[PDB]
């Protein structure tokens, strides 16, 4: 069982994602240049959102000795913690080790307990430390994104052999390509001086880059791997799925949002329950042009509906029917004015969509699973 979400979202002129040179990220799809938002950007912006705050139970940090000291209070153990962290093959470069470590935040108290007491020796404690980082996987964000950690080998203690420290990802997120051509734009900005002088010149002159586009977002969630990642916690898994849907719908990446504030909502969501993943990114191999009789979002939704009809009619299998829901606010945008048959249910409220998704998933109610 797989839950796949396809979203169409037109954005105001902004620079939500950019590369090292400041230009917005682009890609070549279908021989044509399209605007892109990187998948890790979307994953982080969903993960660190306000609507996902009740599920954030993991930290991906480089400074673990600082957390050890900040959770141990006043007793001085920072050098000792750095030493034991170095003993398990992590190295140390000025209070931050050479690698990022993904671990649930509940286990910092245990690490503080092992680092505080002098009853145990050093090296064996290092081995014990490994046994806490190899088992700190009971977090929703670790369960969704997935973790892999390979420690060093040239400074290990030879008695600190590691267990399996990987978690298979239960969520696949694509790169948000654009449905039409790329139209990069340059904003020539100046920055003036508040104190008058001799000349009329300003403090700074520069140029920024921005673009406005309609993006096609694709997400996939593996329910079985999700409930295996949290060790059979179906309630918590459903809570993660619902909170993830709410956060993905109601959050945007915070890149240059104090100057552009492109806080635009999606204009169409399609949620399908399948057994094998299918991507509708090939709906826009031909880029979407503009006709006066319609607009960009309606044309994109019509193209998506046409390709969905093509896929369903060309890959129909009586063994695995597919059930999908289409969501548009107050049914503003239907799935094209040609078929009225690819959407099993038409929903106009986001909360009703989330409730129906949860009820299909396990028959639970939203307010039951929110705690």
């Amino acid at each position: 069982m797989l839950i796949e979400i396809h979203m169409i979202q037109n954005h105001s002129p902004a620079n939500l994602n950019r590369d090292d040179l400041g230009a917005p990220k682009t890609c070549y799809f279908g021989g044509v240049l399209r605007s892109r938002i990187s998948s890790q950007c979307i994953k982080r912006s969903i993960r660190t959102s306000n609507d996902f705050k009740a599920l954030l139970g993991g930290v991906r940090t480089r400074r673990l000795a600082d957390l050890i000291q900040q959770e141990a209070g006043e007793t001085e153990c920072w050098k000792k913690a750095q030493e034991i962290l170095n003993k398990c093959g992590f190295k140390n470069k000025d209070d931050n080790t050479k690698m990022l470590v993904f671990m649930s935040k509940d286990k910092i108290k245990d690490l503080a307990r092992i680092v505080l007491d002098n009853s145990l020796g050093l090296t064996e404690a290092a081995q014990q430390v490994a046994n806490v980082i190899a088992q700190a996987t009971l977090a929703p964000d670790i369960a969704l994104c997935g973790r892999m950690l390979e420690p060093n080998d040239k400074d290990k203690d030879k008695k600190v052999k590691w267990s399996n420290t990987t978690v298979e990802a239960a969520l696949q997120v694509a790169h948000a390509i654009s449905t039409h051509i790329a139209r990069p734009e340059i904003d020539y900005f100046v920055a003036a001086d508040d104190v008058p002088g001799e000349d009329a010149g300003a403090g700074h002159i520069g140029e920024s880059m921005f673009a406005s586009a309609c993006f096609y977002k694709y997400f996939s969630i593996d329910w079985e791997q999700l409930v295996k990642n949290l060790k059979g916690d179906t309630n918590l898994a459903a809570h993660t799925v619902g909170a993830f849907l709410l956060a993905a719908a109601k959050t945007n990446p915070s890149g240059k949002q104090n100057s552009f504030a492109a806080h635009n909502y999606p204009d169409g969501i399609l949620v399908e329950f399948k057994n094998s993943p299918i991507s509708y990114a090939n709906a826009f191999v031909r880029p979407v042009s503009v006709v006066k009789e319609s607009d960009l979002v309606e044309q994109s939704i019509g193209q998506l509906s046409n390709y969905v009809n093509d896929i369903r009619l060309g890959y129909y299998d009586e063994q695995s029917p597919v059930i999908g829901f289409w969501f548009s606010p107050n049914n503003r945008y239907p799935l094209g004015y040609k078929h009225s048959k690819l959407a099993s249910r038409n929903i106009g409220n986001l909360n009703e969509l989330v409730g129906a998704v949860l009820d299909y998933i396990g028959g639970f109610k939203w307010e039951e699973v929110q705690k």
């Binding site: 042009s289 006709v291 006066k292 009789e293």
Partner: protein, 349 residues
């Protein structure tokens, strides 16, 4: 004059005729098709197994004289190749990954001339017309892009005239051609010049068996040919890059001149919008224009309504479809265009 030699076209996207110096996890290749490789190709085309090949077929076919002409040298391209990733490997077993690096020839073509007994060539060509097994170019991941049974057999004297017989086939019109084509051919003693020249080099591709693979050396020489003098440049077949059909346009055509008359009869010589007497006919559904004209999608119109519809089509978008009267939509805009045409068009033009 029965034919005495057989010609092989060996051309594919990827090719790999492995060399003797691999012996390890560095699977190399030779610059030309080896004799043992083409012999194995022939035996696979004739349905002879590895054990059955070593008794009679390979000693019989090892007496032929072979020469390879280079049509396109190709580019040597490598490939990182792992084995047993996520799975165990043989020898007990071990959970480990095997690393290797393979070499292929990309965009290359060779012509092979194999002179021998006329019955042998006839039977070989008959077998190669319908091969028993799938024949690839060295490795199983290298199927040919051109038919091996392409050039007809013939009767000649030397290998140079044999490689001169087949013309060089050209790709797309802009593409240039190699000017000196190297030929790599077997050294022939002649029973008088018993000692080979010093330029003759040893290759190690004379096969005996295939299951315990065994090879012996042979003296091979390399000469050259000049294109045009020796091989005539053949002309490419009728082909082009695929372009979508841009249709055509022709009214003078009498068939359309009568289709419009049928339309004006069938809609009773009246406009569809304003019901005025008709003047012309609008060509909705522009697909199948000129030769496949069906008098159904056409719709009779007066001059003002046709001009208004052309105004609407010139503006906004324009594709193979058109704007069709009798649609409940577009009526208001057509009437607005009628108002503008009536109150703004000046006949002094």
């Amino acid at each position: 004059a029965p034919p005495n030699t057989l010609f092989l076209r060996l051309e594919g996207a990827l090719q790999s005729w492995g060399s003797n110096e691999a012996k390890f996890a560095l699977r190399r290749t030779a610059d030309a098709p080896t004799k043992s490789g083409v012999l194995g190709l022939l035996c696979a085309a004739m349905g002879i197994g590895r054990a059955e090949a070593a008794d009679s077929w390979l000693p019989k076919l090892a007496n032929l004289r072979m020469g390879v002409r280079i049509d396109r040298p190709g580019i040597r391209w490598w490939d990182f190749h792992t084995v047993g990733a996520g799975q165990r490997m043989r020898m007990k077993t071990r959970a480990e990954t095997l690393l290797s690096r393979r070499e292929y020839l990309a965009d290359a073509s060779f012509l092979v001339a194999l002179q021998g007994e006329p019955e042998l060539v006839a039977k070989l060509s008959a077998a190669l017309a319908k091969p028993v097994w799938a024949i690839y170019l060295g490795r199983k991941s290298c199927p040919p892009s051109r038919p091996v049974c392409e050039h007809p057999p013939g009767f000649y004297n030397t290998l140079e005239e044999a490689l001169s017989a087949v013309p060089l086939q050209k790709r797309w019109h802009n593409e240039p051609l190699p000017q000196i084509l190297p030929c790599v051919m077997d050294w022939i003693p002649g029973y008088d010049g018993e000692h080979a020249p010093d330029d003759a080099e040893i290759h190690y591709d004379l096969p005996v068996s295939f299951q315990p693979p065994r090879h012996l050396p042979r003296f091979v020489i390399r000469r050259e040919l000049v294109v045009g003098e020796d091989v005539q440049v053949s002309r490419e077949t009728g082909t082009s890059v695929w372009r979508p059909k841009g249709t055509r346009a022709d009214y003078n055509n009498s068939e359309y001149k009568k289709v419009r008359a049928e339309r004006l009869v069938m809609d009773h010589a009246a406009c569809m919008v304003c019901k005025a007497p008709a003047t012309t006919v609008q060509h909705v559904n522009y697909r199948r224009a000129g030769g496949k004209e069906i008098p159904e999608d056409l719709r009779a119109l007066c001059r003002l309504c046709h001009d208004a519809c052309t105004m609407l089509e010139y503006g906004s978008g324009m594709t193979t479809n058109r704007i069709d009267p009798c649609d409940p939509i577009w009526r208001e805009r057509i009437l607005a265009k009628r108002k503008e045409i009536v109150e703004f068009r000046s006949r002094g033009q």
